[PDB]
Amino acid sequence: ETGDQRFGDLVFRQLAPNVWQHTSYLDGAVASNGLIVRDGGRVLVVDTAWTDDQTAQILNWIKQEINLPVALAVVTHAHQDKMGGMDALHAAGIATYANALSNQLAPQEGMVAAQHSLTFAANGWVEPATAPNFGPLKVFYPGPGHTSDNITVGIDGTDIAFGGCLIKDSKAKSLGNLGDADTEHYAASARAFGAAFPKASMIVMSHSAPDSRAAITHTARMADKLR
Ligand SMILES: O[B-](O)(O)c1cc2cc(CBr)ccc2s1
Ligand SMILES: [Ca+2]
Ligand SMILES: [Ca+2]
Ligand SMILES: [Ca+2]
Numbered sequence: 001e002t003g004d005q006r007f008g009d010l011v012f013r014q015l016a017p018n019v020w021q022h023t024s025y026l027d028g029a030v031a032s033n034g035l036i037v038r039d040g041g042r043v044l045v046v047d048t049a050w051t052d053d054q055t056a057q058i059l060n061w062i063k064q065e066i067n068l069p070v071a072l073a074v075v076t077h078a079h080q081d082k083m084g085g086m087d088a089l090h091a092a093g094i095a096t097y098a099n100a101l102s103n104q105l106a107p108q109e110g111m112v113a114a115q116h117s118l119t120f121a122a123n124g125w126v127e128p129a130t131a132p133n134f135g136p137l138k139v140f141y142p143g144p145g146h147t148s149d150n151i152t153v154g155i156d157g158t159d160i161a162f163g164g165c166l167i168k169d170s171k172a173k174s175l176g177n178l179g180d181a182d183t184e185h186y187a188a189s190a191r192a193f194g195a196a197f198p199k200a201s202m203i204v205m206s207h208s209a210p211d212s213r214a215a216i217t218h219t220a221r222m223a224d225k226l227r
């Protein structure tokens with residue numbers, strides 16, 4: 001697409017003045033998207049790429065095009081598209097945060113655990129002391145859906161919310177990989193994510209281009225048929 005930039009195996013698309021989407025491919029060639037946020041004098045990353053080499057490519061692109069230190073990364077669940085690059089984040093000295101449940105499931109899912117655990121209230125909001133100096137990232141656990149551990153992130157100051165692999169696009173035909181999914185609670189979880197970030201108009205997700213809020217309602221409608 002016009003305006004996109006390629007660095008090695010990675011493609012970046014600016015979504016807002018201080019937000020970019022990172023896309024990595026794993027062989028057909030499957031795309032996974034995460035986010036890069038410029039918060040003042042530092043950078044925040046949401047999700048790794050599929051692999052350590054791909055994740056290092058994100059870090060080098062950030063140094064070349066943004067030239068600000070990467071303070072921390074939040075990863076959205078314990079699967080390869082979201083945490084495959086944890087060793088690269090650790091080698092680069094980036095503090096890593098995941099849901100505690102993602103850190104618990106990580107060895108069983110073949111992932112490396114993050115250095116810190118985020119915990120959540122009954123209402124899905126992160127307990128603030130487990131998310132120190134997160135700037136505009138607002139972390140919400142919507143309930144089990146794509147996986148039991150899936151978390152979501154709002155970028156405060158923007159129109160952007162990230163559903164990760166929980167949300168799928170509004171023309172989708174399936175919910176994608178349901179092997180570790182909670183079929184009963186998925187619809188409610190997708191709706192809870194839309195309610196958490198009621199004013200977000202750009203919904204970014206792992207396996208499609210950014211969509212409108214129609215991705216949330218469409219994903220919930222498809223999920224209703226699993227219960
Ligand atoms: O459930 B999801 O985090 O969306 C994953 C999709 C996927 C695909 C391959 C081969 Br292409 C290997 C690992 C994973 S994980
Ligand atoms: Ca590794
Ligand atoms: Ca599994
Ligand atoms: Ca039940």
Ligand SMILES: [Zn+2]
Nearest residue numbers: 077079146165
């Ligand atoms: Zn997954």
Ligand SMILES: [Zn+2]
Nearest residue numbers: 032081165206
């Ligand atoms: Zn995924």
